[PDB]
Design a protein around this ligand. Sequence first.
Ligand SMILES: Cc1nc(C)c(-c2ccnc(Nc3ccc(N(C)C)c(Cl)c3)n2)s1
Length: 291
Amino acid sequence: MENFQKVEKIGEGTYGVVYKARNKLTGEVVALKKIRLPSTAIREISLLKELNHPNIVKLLDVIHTENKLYLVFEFLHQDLKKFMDASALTGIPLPLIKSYLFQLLQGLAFCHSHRVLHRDLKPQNLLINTEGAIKLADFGLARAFGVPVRTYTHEVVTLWYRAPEILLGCKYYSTAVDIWSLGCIFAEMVTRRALFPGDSEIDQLFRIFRTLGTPDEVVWPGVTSMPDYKPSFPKWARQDFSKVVPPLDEDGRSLLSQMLHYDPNKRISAKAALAHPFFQDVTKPVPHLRL
Ligand SMILES: Cc1nc(C)c(-c2ccnc(Nc3ccc(N(C)C)c(Cl)c3)n2)s1
């Protein structure tokens, strides 16, 4: 770590704090994730160094030294969260929303083809550059490790993009959890409001049920047998997407509805989503970035 000079803090994840830093050997600026503290973890994270794609933030190095684990990522100039906040008065242009969703589906189709799941997509780990690219950052493992950031900071775990199977206690979930999260982020880019801003696990689940209807065996076979399912859940009727994401057109609303299917087996895959008619006229616009 003597080779890196911290510039400023740029983020706080669930298990690590992220800094902008300078590599003293090469002169390059990087994003450095510091995890406060497992051999299986070192091996699995090292496998992520091989997972290279245009829509994935490059994991440059894994440094294991003195009861800390440092992840060195390529540096991108802004996150989607800052861009959405900066665009709150005007809205992100629909062609740019479509480009970003298309690129993130390309990134997910690639990592899902290598049986790599993100598991915690959110605007703070979607990174953009001045050329119009957007990239997925910091893929999570199935087994969590290290001191959680919430125990030594004022930061809280966001549940807003969590798939309903995770909230209902499925421990052997699929790549469909990332498609759900991405659908939630797509709706938030379009409407400029989070789709399901829950502040507890039950509030998160009941916000999903109030919009999409309480799931039952008809729409989700096996839902009533899931670990955290309760027959005492209130029964809410489903709402129309025309109410949930105006002014999205019918192709975008149909795609979103397929990304938000309750049954993970019915939920569209990233590969199938790339072929959706919504992307017939996709382009790659330039964002207006204030850095
Ligand atoms: C939570 C995160 N995890 C990672 C690994 C992150 C990462 C990876 C690569 N580049 C960047 N850049 C970046 C992020 C945020 C900001 N401001 C707007 C908060 C900036 Cl100015 C740059 N962040 S951000």
